[PDB]
Amino acid sequence: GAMGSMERASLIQKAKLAEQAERYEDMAAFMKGAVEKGEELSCEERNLLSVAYKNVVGGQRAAWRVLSSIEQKSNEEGSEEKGPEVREYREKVETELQGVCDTVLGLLDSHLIKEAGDAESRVFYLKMKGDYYRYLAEVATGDDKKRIIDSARSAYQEAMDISKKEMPPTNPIRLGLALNFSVFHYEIANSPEEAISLAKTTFDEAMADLHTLSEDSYKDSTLIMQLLRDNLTLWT
């Protein structure tokens, strides 16, 4: 690992500098280096890991969608043949995206998840596992697409089971997990009714628990509740 000679604390420090500089590829490399030191991650370090890779894969996913759309127009009737270049470049971006997803899933499997015993860390990492299998599913077209989708589902489901048992309904990790699993149902699993049911139950149960919260916790939870409501408004 290219980060093997750098101190864990220095990697975390530079991850935070990279975030401020909007150097998210650097941020992700620094956080990968920190994970590979072998120690568990704190709450703030987990969020650095998530923010870094989400920004990296977000650029790739946006690019893949643009290129996929161009590729599909070219396969319409009446479209002029322009050669293999669009497919080739879409495939190049797709392969790079899949490599980033494989890297994150590898970090979770070696060995973040197996050492995560607290609800907050285990649910966080299982949500991440569901998310990055979901991004693999967005580009999957072959024989293992069903298995990729079921890997995402299985990770989300175990995270949901733990979060329901161990976290209050307003917990921001529980809420973001439910938001993402709901989107999984809507656009990956072809299950829009499940997506809507999950978003609405999650919103309603969080609403009924807001009265227990401080002002700052209330702001954190209601922000995510609004994202759930926005999705419901889009879907109904």
Binding site: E22, Y24, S50, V51, K54, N55, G58, G59, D131, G176, L179, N180, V183, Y186, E187, I224, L227, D230, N231, L234, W235
Partner: peptide, 10 residues
Amino acid sequence: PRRNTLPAMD
């Protein structure tokens, strides 16, 4: 206007 997942990009 895309549906929301978390975290969001910068």
